[PDB]
C-alpha cells in the first residue's frame, strides 16, 4: 500500500469543533447512500462518540448533471493544519521541453481517494450525517484516505505519486512522465505501437495501487491546451488569440487587449503595444470609451497582421547551442529571440523595464542581457551565446568607467542597425581657454557674462538642472561648467541618453551638440 | 553516539528560503554529491510534511578538480540558539607572520545531529525547467556551514588539539566555522612542514591550502595630490576633498586654500600658492598621515564593509562600525568585474576574521540579479557573509584612492 505521511495541527491548536448545518431529509438520504458506498470501500469508517471534532458536510449535484455529490467544507481544519512543502508551484515553459514522437495524457481518477491518511490525524476529519427522526441516529465518520478540499491533499498526493512512479521510471528510462496535478503527460519516441503498449504497462502499474486511468479509446489526443499554451509532440504556441474588430473601445477593452498582446510576445515577434498603452492616459473609469489615434490603429492593424500568420515555437535540442539575439525596437524598447537553428525560434520576448529615471542604451542593453540570462538558466539550465548590435569598444568604454560592477557573458557583435553607441562623452579634465560657467537658476562666467533667470513651480533639485541647462544653451562648443549640485553631477555623469524628465532630455540634447564639455563640482558655501 | 540538544531562539520558526536557480552543471554536481552522502547516511530524503528550506550551491575547490557543496545557512544561523569558554579570539593572530587556513569541515560528519533539530536543515536540489519536483533532504549529522557545528564539536576538537597545542605552543590555532587558522612566525619553509604534520596529526584521528601573511597588511590613508603647479580646478578638487575629510579630522582648515579661489577665474588658470596656503596644505597633509585617533572595535556591534569600483581593476574598501570612524581601509587590484568583486569580498572577509574574529556585512556596488547569478562561479570560501546592494555616489569614489 502507499506509505503514510505524518500530519500535525499547528502548535497549540485543537481540532475543529463546528456545527453541521441542518440538512433536508432529501439531502440526508443522498449523503447516507454516498457514505455507505464509501465505508464498504474503506474510504471512511463510522466512529464512536468518543470523538468531539466536527466538520460540516453538504450535498450538491454535478454541474449540468442529475446526480448527488458530497462536499465537505474544510476551512477550519485547514486553518489549523500545519503547512506542507509547496505543491508544484513553478511550471515548465514549453520552449524547454524536448520533442517526442508521441505524448499521452493519462487522467487519474479518484486520485486522492486511493491514498491513506495519517492514522493519528484521521480523528480531525470527523463529520456528521444528520438523522431524520429526532432521537434516532446521527451517523458519525472520519476519513481514512485523503479528503478533497483538505489542505494537505495536493502535496501528499504529489509526493506519493512520485514514489509509485519511481520504479517504472528506472525500468523505463525511455519514457518521460510529467505530473501536473491530476494529469500525467507521458511522452516517448517509441514506434507508435510500442508506445501504446508501454502506456498500457503504465496503466497496469498504477492499477496495482488502485489508480484508475482512461483506456486508449478515451484518452485526450494532442494538441493539448495547457496553461495558455497549445502543445504538440513536435512544436508549441500560445492558444490562438483573436483581435476584435470593434469601432468603440472601452478603457477595459484596451487593458484586456494589452494583456493578451503581452502574452503573445513570447512567440510572436514584432508585437507592439506602446500606442495602445498611451490610450490609458488620464482615464477616469473602466467603462469610459477612448477613440483610437491614427497611431493606435496602425499599431493595432499591424498586430492584427502578425497574429494572422500562426507561428509555433520549436522544442529544445540539448545537443545544440542556444543563441540569443537582441535588437533595439525603439526608444527604450528591445526585442530578442532565442534559437538553436536560424529563424527556428524556441522563444521570443521584449524588454522595456526602465530601472531608474535616466539611462542610456548601453546600460539598458546590459540589463536586457541579465534578464535573458536568468530566464535561460531557468528554462534550459545554461546561458545562451548572445549576438548584440554593439561593438566591444563602445561596451568596454562605458563598463570600464561606470561605478557599478557589471558583466556581460560570451558575445558576438552583429551588424544589425540600429547599433548602440554612446551619444556624447564628458571631458575627463578641464578644457583650456573654454569659457568657465559658474552656476548656482543663473550663471556667471570668467568673461563677465551672466543671467539670473526666472522659474516658477520649480523644485529645489529641478532649479539646479535648469541652471546647467542655461549654461549649455548660451555657451560655445567647448565649455567648463562648475556646479555645487551633487545631484546634477550624478545625473549627468551617468551620461543618460533618455530621461523621464523633459528638462533632462533637453540638457541631453545640448550635450550631444557640444564638442567638449567638462563638469566640475565644488562644495556649497 | 549521544546527541546534544539544539534549539532555535525562543519563539522562532525554521527557515523557508527560496533556492536561487542553478545551471545544469551545478545540479548534476549536487546530485552526485548528495547521492553518496545519502548512501553513507549523512542526509535523508524527506516528505511534504517538512515545509522548511535552505538554498544550496556547488563551488569548486581551489586547485582541485572536485566540487564542494555549499549550504547557505545564513537564515538558520541567525535563528539557532546562541551557544552557552575557550574560543575567544586571539589578538596574536594578526601579528603572526604566516597563517594557514584549513578546511576541517568533514570532521562534523562523524557527530550525529539532534533528531528534533534535523528538519530545520531541509534543502532541495531543483530540477531544470521544473520538469520534476526537486529532491528534498535534511541532515542527520552536523552540517558544514551551520554555526552550531563548531560549538557542538568544540569538546571533541580541543581534545584532539591539546597535544599539538602544548607540543608546539609557538603556534596559534583559531577555528571559525569550517576553518582552522594556524598561525606562526617560523620561516615559510618551517611553517609548511609543521602544517603538514598537523595534517596527519588530525588524520590520526580521522580529520583531513590558503596562506596569509597578516604581518604585512596595512591601512590605505586618504591622500592629497602633490603637484608641480596648481590650477584653479586642482584647488577646487582639493578644497572638496579636504572639506569631506575635515569631518573625520577637524584640524583640517581650508581658509587660505579657499582664498585663492575667489573670483570667477578660468578653470585652467594656474594659481601660485601663497605662503599661508602652502603651510595650510602642509598641516593637512601631516594630519592625514595616520588613522584618526580614538576608534576602537566594539564586539557588540556590527562590522560594516563598503567597496568602491575605482577603475583599471582597482577597488577600495573601508571597514567600520560607525560612519567616518573606520577600523580599516584598504585597496584591492586584480578577468571581469564580478570576478574581481567576489575575490575582494572573500579577501576582506578573511581579514576581518583574522583581525576581529567576525565577518562583516557588505554593501556591494552591483545589481542583485547579476550578483546572484555569478558569485558561485568564483566563490571559494566555505562561509557566506551577509550582503546588501547599493548605489555608489560618484563623490565618494573620488575621495578614495
Ligand atoms: C504540459 C507538459 C509538461 C511537461 N512535459 C510535457 C507536457 N506536455 C506535452 O504535451 C509535451 C509536448 C511535447 C513534448 N513533451 C511534452 N511533455 C513531456 C512529458 C512528455
Ligand atoms: Mg557655484
PDB file of N, CA and C and ligand atoms in Angstrom, chain A residues 92 97-100 103 176-178 185-188 224 226 231-234 315, chain B residues 131, ligand 1:
ATOM      1  N   UNK A  92       6.818  24.172 -16.062  1.00  0.00           N
ATOM      2  CA  UNK A  92       7.663  24.119 -17.263  1.00  0.00           C
ATOM      3  C   UNK A  92       7.273  25.092 -18.354  1.00  0.00           C
ATOM      4  N   UNK A  97      11.143  22.066 -23.325  1.00  0.00           N
ATOM      5  CA  UNK A  97      10.840  20.631 -23.486  1.00  0.00           C
ATOM      6  C   UNK A  97      11.572  20.079 -24.724  1.00  0.00           C
ATOM      7  N   UNK A  98      11.735  18.771 -24.768  1.00  0.00           N
ATOM      8  CA  UNK A  98      12.381  18.143 -25.914  1.00  0.00           C
ATOM      9  C   UNK A  98      11.280  17.484 -26.721  1.00  0.00           C
ATOM     10  N   UNK A  99      11.379  17.514 -28.046  1.00  0.00           N
ATOM     11  CA  UNK A  99      10.352  16.881 -28.846  1.00  0.00           C
ATOM     12  C   UNK A  99      10.273  15.367 -28.613  1.00  0.00           C
ATOM     13  N   UNK A 100       9.065  14.855 -28.777  1.00  0.00           N
ATOM     14  CA  UNK A 100       8.770  13.449 -28.584  1.00  0.00           C
ATOM     15  C   UNK A 100       8.025  12.995 -29.817  1.00  0.00           C
ATOM     16  N   UNK A 103       2.989  11.780 -27.367  1.00  0.00           N
ATOM     17  CA  UNK A 103       2.676  12.239 -25.990  1.00  0.00           C
ATOM     18  C   UNK A 103       1.219  11.846 -25.650  1.00  0.00           C
ATOM     19  N   UNK A 176       9.195   9.503 -20.703  1.00  0.00           N
ATOM     20  CA  UNK A 176       9.226  10.737 -19.951  1.00  0.00           C
ATOM     21  C   UNK A 176       7.823  11.000 -19.444  1.00  0.00           C
ATOM     22  N   UNK A 177       7.713  11.141 -18.131  1.00  0.00           N
ATOM     23  CA  UNK A 177       6.442  11.358 -17.490  1.00  0.00           C
ATOM     24  C   UNK A 177       6.413  12.693 -16.738  1.00  0.00           C
ATOM     25  N   UNK A 178       5.381  13.511 -16.950  1.00  0.00           N
ATOM     26  CA  UNK A 178       5.260  14.778 -16.245  1.00  0.00           C
ATOM     27  C   UNK A 178       3.967  14.714 -15.492  1.00  0.00           C
ATOM     28  N   UNK A 185       1.393  13.488 -18.189  1.00  0.00           N
ATOM     29  CA  UNK A 185       1.717  13.585 -19.607  1.00  0.00           C
ATOM     30  C   UNK A 185       2.880  12.580 -19.787  1.00  0.00           C
ATOM     31  N   UNK A 186       2.740  11.686 -20.759  1.00  0.00           N
ATOM     32  CA  UNK A 186       3.714  10.615 -20.955  1.00  0.00           C
ATOM     33  C   UNK A 186       4.187  10.647 -22.384  1.00  0.00           C
ATOM     34  N   UNK A 187       5.466  10.922 -22.569  1.00  0.00           N
ATOM     35  CA  UNK A 187       5.973  11.021 -23.914  1.00  0.00           C
ATOM     36  C   UNK A 187       7.074  10.039 -24.181  1.00  0.00           C
ATOM     37  N   UNK A 188       7.213   9.686 -25.455  1.00  0.00           N
ATOM     38  CA  UNK A 188       8.262   8.788 -25.862  1.00  0.00           C
ATOM     39  C   UNK A 188       8.512   8.957 -27.325  1.00  0.00           C
ATOM     40  N   UNK A 224      -2.605  19.452 -26.905  1.00  0.00           N
ATOM     41  CA  UNK A 224      -3.089  19.593 -25.551  1.00  0.00           C
ATOM     42  C   UNK A 224      -3.087  21.106 -25.260  1.00  0.00           C
ATOM     43  N   UNK A 226      -2.609  23.582 -22.660  1.00  0.00           N
ATOM     44  CA  UNK A 226      -2.219  23.637 -21.264  1.00  0.00           C
ATOM     45  C   UNK A 226      -1.672  25.010 -20.850  1.00  0.00           C
ATOM     46  N   UNK A 231       0.144  22.633 -26.976  1.00  0.00           N
ATOM     47  CA  UNK A 231       1.269  21.697 -27.153  1.00  0.00           C
ATOM     48  C   UNK A 231       1.120  20.512 -28.137  1.00  0.00           C
ATOM     49  N   UNK A 232       2.099  20.348 -29.022  1.00  0.00           N
ATOM     50  CA  UNK A 232       2.153  19.221 -29.964  1.00  0.00           C
ATOM     51  C   UNK A 232       3.379  18.424 -29.543  1.00  0.00           C
ATOM     52  N   UNK A 233       3.515  17.160 -29.984  1.00  0.00           N
ATOM     53  CA  UNK A 233       4.718  16.413 -29.561  1.00  0.00           C
ATOM     54  C   UNK A 233       5.993  17.063 -30.129  1.00  0.00           C
ATOM     55  N   UNK A 234       5.812  17.695 -31.298  1.00  0.00           N
ATOM     56  CA  UNK A 234       6.863  18.350 -32.055  1.00  0.00           C
ATOM     57  C   UNK A 234       6.933  19.884 -32.128  1.00  0.00           C
ATOM     58  N   UNK A 315      10.973  22.871 -30.094  1.00  0.00           N
ATOM     59  CA  UNK A 315      11.420  22.401 -28.776  1.00  0.00           C
ATOM     60  C   UNK A 315      12.934  22.359 -28.662  1.00  0.00           C
TER      61      UNK A 315
ATOM     62  N   UNK B 131      10.670  20.467 -14.592  1.00  0.00           N
ATOM     63  CA  UNK B 131      10.181  19.231 -15.157  1.00  0.00           C
ATOM     64  C   UNK B 131       9.952  18.086 -14.134  1.00  0.00           C
TER      65      UNK B 131
HETATM   66  C1  LIG C   1       2.362  20.012 -20.291  1.00  0.00           C
HETATM   67  C2  LIG C   1       3.672  19.244 -20.273  1.00  0.00           C
HETATM   68  C3  LIG C   1       4.582  19.457 -19.265  1.00  0.00           C
HETATM   69  C4  LIG C   1       5.781  18.747 -19.275  1.00  0.00           C
HETATM   70  N1  LIG C   1       6.097  17.854 -20.239  1.00  0.00           N
HETATM   71  C5  LIG C   1       5.210  17.639 -21.236  1.00  0.00           C
HETATM   72  C6  LIG C   1       3.979  18.326 -21.280  1.00  0.00           C
HETATM   73  N2  LIG C   1       3.021  18.075 -22.299  1.00  0.00           N
HETATM   74  C7  LIG C   1       3.163  17.816 -23.596  1.00  0.00           C
HETATM   75  O1  LIG C   1       2.175  17.688 -24.332  1.00  0.00           O
HETATM   76  C8  LIG C   1       4.550  17.738 -24.220  1.00  0.00           C
HETATM   77  C9  LIG C   1       4.694  18.160 -25.545  1.00  0.00           C
HETATM   78  C10 LIG C   1       5.829  17.873 -26.220  1.00  0.00           C
HETATM   79  C11 LIG C   1       6.824  17.158 -25.574  1.00  0.00           C
HETATM   80  N3  LIG C   1       6.730  16.743 -24.292  1.00  0.00           N
HETATM   81  C12 LIG C   1       5.611  17.033 -23.616  1.00  0.00           C
HETATM   82  N4  LIG C   1       5.540  16.608 -22.258  1.00  0.00           N
HETATM   83  C13 LIG C   1       6.587  15.669 -21.867  1.00  0.00           C
HETATM   84  C14 LIG C   1       6.244  14.713 -20.776  1.00  0.00           C
HETATM   85  C15 LIG C   1       6.347  14.241 -22.187  1.00  0.00           C
END
